[PDB]
PDB file of N, CA, C and O in Angstrom:
ATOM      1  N   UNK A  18     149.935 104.707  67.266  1.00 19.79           N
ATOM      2  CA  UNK A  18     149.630 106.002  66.682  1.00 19.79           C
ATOM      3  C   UNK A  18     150.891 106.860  66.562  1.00 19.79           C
ATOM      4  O   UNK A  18     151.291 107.084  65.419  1.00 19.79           O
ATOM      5  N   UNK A  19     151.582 107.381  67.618  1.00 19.59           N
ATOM      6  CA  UNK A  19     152.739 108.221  67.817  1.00 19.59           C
ATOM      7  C   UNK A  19     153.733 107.435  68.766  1.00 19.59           C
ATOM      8  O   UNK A  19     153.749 107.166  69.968  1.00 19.59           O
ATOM      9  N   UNK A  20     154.704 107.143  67.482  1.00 19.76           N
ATOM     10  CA  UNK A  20     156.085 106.234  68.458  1.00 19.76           C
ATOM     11  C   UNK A  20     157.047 107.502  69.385  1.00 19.76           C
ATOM     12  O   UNK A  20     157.683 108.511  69.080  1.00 19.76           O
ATOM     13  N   UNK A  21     156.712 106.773  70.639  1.00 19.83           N
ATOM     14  CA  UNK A  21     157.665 107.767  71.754  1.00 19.83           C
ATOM     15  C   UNK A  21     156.610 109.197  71.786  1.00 19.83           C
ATOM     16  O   UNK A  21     155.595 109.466  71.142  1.00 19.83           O
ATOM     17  N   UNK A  22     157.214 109.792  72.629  1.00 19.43           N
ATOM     18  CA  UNK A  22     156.998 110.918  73.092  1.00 19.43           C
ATOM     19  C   UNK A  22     155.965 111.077  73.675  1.00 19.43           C
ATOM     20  O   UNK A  22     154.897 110.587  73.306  1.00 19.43           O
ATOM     21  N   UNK A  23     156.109 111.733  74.599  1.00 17.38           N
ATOM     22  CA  UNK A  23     154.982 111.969  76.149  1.00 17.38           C
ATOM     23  C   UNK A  23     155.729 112.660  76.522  1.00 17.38           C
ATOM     24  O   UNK A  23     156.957 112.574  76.531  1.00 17.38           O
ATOM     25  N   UNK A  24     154.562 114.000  77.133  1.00 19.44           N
ATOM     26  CA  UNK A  24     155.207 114.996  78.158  1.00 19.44           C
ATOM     27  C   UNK A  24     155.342 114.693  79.203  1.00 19.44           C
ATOM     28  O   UNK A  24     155.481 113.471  79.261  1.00 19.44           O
ATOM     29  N   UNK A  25     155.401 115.374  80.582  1.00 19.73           N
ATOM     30  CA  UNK A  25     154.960 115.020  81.748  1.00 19.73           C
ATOM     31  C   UNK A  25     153.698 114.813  82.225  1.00 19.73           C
ATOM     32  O   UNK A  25     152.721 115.001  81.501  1.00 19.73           O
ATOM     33  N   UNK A  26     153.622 114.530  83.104  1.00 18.82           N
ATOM     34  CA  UNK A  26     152.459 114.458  84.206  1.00 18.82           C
ATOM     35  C   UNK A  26     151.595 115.062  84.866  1.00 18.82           C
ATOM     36  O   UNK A  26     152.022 115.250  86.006  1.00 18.82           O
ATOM     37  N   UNK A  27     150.555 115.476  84.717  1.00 16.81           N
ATOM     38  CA  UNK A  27     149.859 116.698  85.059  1.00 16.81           C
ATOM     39  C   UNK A  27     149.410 116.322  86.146  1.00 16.81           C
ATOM     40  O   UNK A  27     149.861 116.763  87.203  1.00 16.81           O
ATOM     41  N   UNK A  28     148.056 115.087  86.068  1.00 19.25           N
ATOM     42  CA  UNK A  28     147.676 114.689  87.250  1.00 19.25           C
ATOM     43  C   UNK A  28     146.494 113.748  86.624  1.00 19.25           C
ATOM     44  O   UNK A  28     145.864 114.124  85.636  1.00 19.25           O
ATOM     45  N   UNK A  29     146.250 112.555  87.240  1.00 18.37           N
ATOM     46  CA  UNK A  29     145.697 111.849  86.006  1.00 18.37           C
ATOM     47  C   UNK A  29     146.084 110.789  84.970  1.00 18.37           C
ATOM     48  O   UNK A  29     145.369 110.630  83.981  1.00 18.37           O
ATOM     49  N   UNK A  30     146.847 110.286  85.102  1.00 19.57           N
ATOM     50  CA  UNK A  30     147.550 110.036  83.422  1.00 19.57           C
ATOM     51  C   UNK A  30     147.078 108.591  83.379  1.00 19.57           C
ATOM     52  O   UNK A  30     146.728 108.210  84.496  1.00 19.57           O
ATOM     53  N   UNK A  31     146.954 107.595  82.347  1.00 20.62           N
ATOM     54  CA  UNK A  31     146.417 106.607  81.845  1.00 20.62           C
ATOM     55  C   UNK A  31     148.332 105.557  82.992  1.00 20.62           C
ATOM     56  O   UNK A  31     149.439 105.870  83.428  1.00 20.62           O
ATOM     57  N   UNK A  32     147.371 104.270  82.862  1.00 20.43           N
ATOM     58  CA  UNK A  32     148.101 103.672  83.858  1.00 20.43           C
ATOM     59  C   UNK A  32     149.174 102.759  82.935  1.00 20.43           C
ATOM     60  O   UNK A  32     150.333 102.916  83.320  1.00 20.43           O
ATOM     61  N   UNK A  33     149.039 101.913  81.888  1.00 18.40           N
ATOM     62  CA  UNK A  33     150.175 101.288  80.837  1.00 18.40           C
ATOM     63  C   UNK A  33     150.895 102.661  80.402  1.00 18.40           C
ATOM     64  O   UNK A  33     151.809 102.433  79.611  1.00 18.40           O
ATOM     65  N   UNK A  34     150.731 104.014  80.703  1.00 19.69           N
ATOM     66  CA  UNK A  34     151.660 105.241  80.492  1.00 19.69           C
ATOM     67  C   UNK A  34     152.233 105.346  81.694  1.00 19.69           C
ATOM     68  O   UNK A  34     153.150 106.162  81.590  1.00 19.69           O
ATOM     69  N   UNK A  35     152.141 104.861  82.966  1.00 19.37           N
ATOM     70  CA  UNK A  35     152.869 105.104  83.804  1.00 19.37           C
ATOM     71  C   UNK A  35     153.647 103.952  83.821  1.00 19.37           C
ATOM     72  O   UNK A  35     154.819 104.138  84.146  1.00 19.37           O
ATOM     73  N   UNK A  36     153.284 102.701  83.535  1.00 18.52           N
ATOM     74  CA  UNK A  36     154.058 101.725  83.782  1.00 18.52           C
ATOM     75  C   UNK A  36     154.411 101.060  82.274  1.00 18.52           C
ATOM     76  O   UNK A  36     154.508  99.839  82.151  1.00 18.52           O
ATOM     77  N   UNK A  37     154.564 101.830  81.322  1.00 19.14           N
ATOM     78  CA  UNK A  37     155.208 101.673  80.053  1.00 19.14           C
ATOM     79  C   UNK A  37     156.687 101.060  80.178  1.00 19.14           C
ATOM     80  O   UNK A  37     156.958  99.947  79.728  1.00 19.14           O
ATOM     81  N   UNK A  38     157.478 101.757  80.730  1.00 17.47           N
ATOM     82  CA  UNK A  38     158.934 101.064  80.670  1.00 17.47           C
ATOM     83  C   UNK A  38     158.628  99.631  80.989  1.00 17.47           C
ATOM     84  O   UNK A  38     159.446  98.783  80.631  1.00 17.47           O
ATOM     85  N   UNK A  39     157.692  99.318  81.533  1.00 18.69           N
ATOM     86  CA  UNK A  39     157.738  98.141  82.159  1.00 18.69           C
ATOM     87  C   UNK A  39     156.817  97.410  81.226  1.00 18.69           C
ATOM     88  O   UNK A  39     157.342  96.323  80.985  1.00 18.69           O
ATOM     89  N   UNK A  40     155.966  97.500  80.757  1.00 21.62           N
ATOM     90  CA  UNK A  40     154.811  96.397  79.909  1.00 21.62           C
ATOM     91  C   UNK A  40     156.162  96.460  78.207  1.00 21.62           C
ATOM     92  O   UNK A  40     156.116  95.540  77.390  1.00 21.62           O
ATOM     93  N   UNK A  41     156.958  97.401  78.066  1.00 23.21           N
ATOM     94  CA  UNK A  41     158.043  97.072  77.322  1.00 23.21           C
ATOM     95  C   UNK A  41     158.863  96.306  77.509  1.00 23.21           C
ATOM     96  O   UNK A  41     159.155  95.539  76.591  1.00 23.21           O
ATOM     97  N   UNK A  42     159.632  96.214  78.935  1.00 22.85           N
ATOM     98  CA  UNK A  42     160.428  95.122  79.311  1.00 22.85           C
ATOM     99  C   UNK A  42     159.433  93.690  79.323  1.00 22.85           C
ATOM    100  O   UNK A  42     159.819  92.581  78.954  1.00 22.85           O
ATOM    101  N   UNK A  43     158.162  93.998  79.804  1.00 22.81           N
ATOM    102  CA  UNK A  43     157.634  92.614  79.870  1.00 22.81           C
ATOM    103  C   UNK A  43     157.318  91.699  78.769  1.00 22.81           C
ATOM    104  O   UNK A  43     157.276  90.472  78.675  1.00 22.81           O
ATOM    105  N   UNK A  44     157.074  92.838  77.833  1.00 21.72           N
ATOM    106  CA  UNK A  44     156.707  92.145  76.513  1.00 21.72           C
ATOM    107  C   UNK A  44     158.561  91.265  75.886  1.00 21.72           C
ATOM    108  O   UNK A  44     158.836  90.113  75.551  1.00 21.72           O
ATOM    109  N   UNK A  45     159.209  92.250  75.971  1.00 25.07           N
ATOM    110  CA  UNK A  45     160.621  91.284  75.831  1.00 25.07           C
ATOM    111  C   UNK A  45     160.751  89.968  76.222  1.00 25.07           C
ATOM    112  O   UNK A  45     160.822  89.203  75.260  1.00 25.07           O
ATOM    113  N   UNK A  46     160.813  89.371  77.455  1.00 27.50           N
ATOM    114  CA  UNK A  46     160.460  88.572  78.494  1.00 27.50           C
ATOM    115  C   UNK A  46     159.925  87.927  77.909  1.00 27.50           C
ATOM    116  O   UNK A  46     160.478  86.838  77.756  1.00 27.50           O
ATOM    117  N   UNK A  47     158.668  88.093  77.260  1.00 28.01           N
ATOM    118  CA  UNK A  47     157.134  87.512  76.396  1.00 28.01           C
ATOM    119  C   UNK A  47     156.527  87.486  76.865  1.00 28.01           C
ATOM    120  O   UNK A  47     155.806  86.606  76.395  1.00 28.01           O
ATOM    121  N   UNK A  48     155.942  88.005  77.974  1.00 28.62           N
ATOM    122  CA  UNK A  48     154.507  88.682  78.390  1.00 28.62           C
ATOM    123  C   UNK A  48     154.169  89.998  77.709  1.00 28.62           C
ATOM    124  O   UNK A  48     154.372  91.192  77.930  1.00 28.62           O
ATOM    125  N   UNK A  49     153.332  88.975  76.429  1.00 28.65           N
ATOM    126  CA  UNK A  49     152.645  89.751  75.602  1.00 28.65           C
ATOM    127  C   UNK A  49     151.099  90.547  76.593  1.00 28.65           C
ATOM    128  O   UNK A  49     150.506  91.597  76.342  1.00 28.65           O
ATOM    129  N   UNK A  50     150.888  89.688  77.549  1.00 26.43           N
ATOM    130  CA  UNK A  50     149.581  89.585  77.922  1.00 26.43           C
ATOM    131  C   UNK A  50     149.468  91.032  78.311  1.00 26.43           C
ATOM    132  O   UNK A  50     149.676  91.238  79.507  1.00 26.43           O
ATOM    133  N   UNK A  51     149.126  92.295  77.423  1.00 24.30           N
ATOM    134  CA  UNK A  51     148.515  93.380  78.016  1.00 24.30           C
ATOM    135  C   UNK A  51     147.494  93.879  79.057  1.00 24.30           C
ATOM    136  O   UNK A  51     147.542  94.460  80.141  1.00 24.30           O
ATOM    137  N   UNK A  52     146.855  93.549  78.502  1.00 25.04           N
ATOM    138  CA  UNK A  52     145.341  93.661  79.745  1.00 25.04           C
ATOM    139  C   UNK A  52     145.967  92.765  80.989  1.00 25.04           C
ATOM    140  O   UNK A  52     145.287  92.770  82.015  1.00 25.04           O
ATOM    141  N   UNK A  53     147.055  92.083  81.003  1.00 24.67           N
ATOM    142  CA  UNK A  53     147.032  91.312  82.315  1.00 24.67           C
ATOM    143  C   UNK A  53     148.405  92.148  82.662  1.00 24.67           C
ATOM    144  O   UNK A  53     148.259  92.585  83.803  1.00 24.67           O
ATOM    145  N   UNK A  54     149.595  92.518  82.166  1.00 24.15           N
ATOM    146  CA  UNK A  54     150.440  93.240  82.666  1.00 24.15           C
ATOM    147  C   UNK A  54     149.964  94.284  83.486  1.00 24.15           C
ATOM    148  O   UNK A  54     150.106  94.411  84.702  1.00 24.15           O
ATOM    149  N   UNK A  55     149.204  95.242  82.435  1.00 22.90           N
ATOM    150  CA  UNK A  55     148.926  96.546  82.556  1.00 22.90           C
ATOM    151  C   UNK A  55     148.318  96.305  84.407  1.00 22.90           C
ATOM    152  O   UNK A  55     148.891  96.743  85.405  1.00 22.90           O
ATOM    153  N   UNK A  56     146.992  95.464  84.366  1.00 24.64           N
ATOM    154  CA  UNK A  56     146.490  95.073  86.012  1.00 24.64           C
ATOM    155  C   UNK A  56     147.437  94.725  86.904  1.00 24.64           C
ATOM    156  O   UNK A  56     147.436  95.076  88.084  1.00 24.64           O
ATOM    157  N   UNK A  57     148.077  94.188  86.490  1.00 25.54           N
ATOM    158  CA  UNK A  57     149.201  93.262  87.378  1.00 25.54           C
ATOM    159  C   UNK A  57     150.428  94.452  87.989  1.00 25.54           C
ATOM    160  O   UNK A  57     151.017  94.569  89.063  1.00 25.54           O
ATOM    161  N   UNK A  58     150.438  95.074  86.939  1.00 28.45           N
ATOM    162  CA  UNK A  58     151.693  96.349  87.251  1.00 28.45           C
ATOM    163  C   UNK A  58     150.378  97.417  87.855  1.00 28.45           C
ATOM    164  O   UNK A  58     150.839  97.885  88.896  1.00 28.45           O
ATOM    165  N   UNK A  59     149.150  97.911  87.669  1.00 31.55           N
ATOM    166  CA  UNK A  59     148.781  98.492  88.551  1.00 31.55           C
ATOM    167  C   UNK A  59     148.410  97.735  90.423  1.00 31.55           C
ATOM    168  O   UNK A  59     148.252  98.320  91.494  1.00 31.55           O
ATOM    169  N   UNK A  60     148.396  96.264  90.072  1.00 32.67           N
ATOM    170  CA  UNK A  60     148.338  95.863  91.439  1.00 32.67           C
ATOM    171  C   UNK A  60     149.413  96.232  91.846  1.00 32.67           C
ATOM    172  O   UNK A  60     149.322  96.767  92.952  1.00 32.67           O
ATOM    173  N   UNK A  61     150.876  96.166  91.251  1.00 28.46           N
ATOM    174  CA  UNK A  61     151.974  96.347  91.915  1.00 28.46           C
ATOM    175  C   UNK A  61     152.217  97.588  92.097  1.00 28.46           C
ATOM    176  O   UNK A  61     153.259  97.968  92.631  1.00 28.46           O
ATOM    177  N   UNK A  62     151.341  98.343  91.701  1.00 27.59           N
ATOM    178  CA  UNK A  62     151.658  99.802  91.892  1.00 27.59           C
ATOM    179  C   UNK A  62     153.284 100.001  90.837  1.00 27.59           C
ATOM    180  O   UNK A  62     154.347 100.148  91.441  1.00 27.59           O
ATOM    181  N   UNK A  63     153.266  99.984  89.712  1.00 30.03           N
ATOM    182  CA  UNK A  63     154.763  99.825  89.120  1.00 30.03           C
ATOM    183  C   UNK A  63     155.975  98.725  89.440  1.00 30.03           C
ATOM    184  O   UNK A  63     156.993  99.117  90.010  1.00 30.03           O
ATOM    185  N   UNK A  64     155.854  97.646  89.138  1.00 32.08           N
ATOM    186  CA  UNK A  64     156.493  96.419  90.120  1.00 32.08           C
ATOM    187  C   UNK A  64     156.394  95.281  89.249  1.00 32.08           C
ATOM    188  O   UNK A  64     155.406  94.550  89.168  1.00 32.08           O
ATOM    189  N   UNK A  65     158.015  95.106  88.270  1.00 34.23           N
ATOM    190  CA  UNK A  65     157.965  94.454  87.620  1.00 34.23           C
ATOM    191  C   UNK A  65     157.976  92.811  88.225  1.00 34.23           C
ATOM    192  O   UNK A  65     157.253  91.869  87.900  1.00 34.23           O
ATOM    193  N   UNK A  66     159.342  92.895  89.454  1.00 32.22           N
ATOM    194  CA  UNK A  66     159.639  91.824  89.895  1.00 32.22           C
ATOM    195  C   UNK A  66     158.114  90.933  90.509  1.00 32.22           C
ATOM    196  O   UNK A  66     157.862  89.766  90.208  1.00 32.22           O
ATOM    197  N   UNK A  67     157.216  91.835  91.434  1.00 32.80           N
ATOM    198  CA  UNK A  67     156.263  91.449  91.758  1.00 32.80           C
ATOM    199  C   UNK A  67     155.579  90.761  90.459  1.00 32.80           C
ATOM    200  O   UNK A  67     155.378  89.585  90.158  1.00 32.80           O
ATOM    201  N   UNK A  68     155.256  92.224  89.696  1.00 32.25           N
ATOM    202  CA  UNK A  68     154.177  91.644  88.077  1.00 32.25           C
ATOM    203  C   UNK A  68     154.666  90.472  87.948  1.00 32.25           C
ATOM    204  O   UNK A  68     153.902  89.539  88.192  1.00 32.25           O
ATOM    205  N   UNK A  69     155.858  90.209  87.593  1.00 31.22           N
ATOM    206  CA  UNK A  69     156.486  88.868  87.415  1.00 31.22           C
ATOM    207  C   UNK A  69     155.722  87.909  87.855  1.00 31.22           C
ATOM    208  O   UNK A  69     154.754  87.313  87.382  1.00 31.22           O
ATOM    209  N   UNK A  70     156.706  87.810  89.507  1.00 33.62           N
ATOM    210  CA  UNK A  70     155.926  86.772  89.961  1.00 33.62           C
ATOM    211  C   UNK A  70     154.546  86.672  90.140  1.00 33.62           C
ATOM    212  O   UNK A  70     154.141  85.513  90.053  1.00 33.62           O
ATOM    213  N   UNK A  71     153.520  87.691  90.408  1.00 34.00           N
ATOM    214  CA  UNK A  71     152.069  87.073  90.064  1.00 34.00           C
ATOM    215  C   UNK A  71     151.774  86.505  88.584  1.00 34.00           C
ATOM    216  O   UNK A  71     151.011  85.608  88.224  1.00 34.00           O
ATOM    217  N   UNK A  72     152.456  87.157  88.011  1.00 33.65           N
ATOM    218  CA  UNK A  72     151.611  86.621  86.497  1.00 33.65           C
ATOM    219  C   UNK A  72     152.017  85.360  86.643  1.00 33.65           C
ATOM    220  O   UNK A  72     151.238  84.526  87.106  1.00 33.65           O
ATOM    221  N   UNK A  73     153.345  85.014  86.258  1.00 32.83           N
ATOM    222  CA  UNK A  73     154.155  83.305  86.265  1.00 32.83           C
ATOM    223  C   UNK A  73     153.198  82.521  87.303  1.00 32.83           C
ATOM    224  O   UNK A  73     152.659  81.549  86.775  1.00 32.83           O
ATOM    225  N   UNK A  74     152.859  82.726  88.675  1.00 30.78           N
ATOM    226  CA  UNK A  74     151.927  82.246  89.245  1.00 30.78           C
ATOM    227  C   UNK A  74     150.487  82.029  88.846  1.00 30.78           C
ATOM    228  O   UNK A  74     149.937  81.137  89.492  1.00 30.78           O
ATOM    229  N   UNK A  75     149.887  82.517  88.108  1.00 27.77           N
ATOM    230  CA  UNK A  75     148.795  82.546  87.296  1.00 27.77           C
ATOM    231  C   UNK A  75     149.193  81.345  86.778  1.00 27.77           C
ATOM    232  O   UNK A  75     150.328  80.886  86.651  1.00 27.77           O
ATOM    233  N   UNK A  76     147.706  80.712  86.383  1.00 26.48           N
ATOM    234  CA  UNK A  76     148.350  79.482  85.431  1.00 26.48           C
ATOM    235  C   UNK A  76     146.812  79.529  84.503  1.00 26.48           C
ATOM    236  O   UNK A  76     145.853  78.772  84.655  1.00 26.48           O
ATOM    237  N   UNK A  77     146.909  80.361  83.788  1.00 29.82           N
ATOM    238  CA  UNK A  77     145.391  80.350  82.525  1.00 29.82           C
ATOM    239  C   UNK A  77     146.067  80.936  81.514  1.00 29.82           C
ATOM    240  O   UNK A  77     145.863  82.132  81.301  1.00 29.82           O
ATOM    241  N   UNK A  78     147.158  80.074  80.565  1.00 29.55           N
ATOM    242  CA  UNK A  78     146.835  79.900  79.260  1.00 29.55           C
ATOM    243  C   UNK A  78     147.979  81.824  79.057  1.00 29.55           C
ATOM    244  O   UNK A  78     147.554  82.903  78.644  1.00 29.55           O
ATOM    245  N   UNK A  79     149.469  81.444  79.581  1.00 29.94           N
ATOM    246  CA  UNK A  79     149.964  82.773  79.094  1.00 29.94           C
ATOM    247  C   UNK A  79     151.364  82.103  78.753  1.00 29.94           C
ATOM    248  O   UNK A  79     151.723  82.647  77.708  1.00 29.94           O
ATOM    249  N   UNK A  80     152.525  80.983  79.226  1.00 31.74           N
ATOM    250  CA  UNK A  80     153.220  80.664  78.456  1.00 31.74           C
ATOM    251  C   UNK A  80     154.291  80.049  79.142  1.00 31.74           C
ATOM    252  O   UNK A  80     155.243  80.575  79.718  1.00 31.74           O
ATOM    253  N   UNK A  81     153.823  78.158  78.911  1.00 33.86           N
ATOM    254  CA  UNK A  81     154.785  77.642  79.835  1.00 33.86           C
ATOM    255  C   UNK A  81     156.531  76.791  79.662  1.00 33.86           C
ATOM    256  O   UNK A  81     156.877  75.717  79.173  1.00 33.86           O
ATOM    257  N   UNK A  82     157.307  77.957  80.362  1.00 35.05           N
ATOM    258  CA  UNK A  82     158.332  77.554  79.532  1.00 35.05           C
ATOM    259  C   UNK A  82     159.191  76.956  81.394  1.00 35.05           C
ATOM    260  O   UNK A  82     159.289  77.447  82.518  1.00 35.05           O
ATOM    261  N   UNK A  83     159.402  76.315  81.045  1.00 37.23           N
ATOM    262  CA  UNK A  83     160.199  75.031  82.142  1.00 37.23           C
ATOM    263  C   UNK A  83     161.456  74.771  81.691  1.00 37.23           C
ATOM    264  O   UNK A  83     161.730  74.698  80.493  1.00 37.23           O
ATOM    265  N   UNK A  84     162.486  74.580  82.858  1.00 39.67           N
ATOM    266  CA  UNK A  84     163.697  74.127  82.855  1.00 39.67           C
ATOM    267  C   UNK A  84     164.868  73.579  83.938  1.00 39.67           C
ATOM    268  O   UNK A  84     165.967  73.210  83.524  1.00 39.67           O
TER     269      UNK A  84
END
């Protein structure tokens, strides 16, 4: 809808808005998987390295790249 911009924080705020910098970096990465970032970074309470490793630990169908 509206690229960028958000005020602050009142009290309340939607949770892929708190952990936006991060479902951006993740999607880079290629964790497209929204609905599973967005959970994964609220399990982590904001926590990419964690999000990381739970998601990569997950194994249902998100993207297996080996080396």
């Amino acid at each position: 809808g509206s690229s960028g911009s958000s005020g602050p924080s009142h009290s309340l705020q939607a949770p892929e808005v708190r952990f936006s910098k991060e479902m951006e970096c993740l999607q880079a990465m290629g964790f497209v998987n929204y609905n599973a970032n967005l959970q994964a970074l609220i399990a982590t309470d904001g926590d990419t390295n964690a999000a990381i490793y739970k998601l990569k630990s997950s194994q249902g169908f998100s993207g297996p790249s080996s080396g």
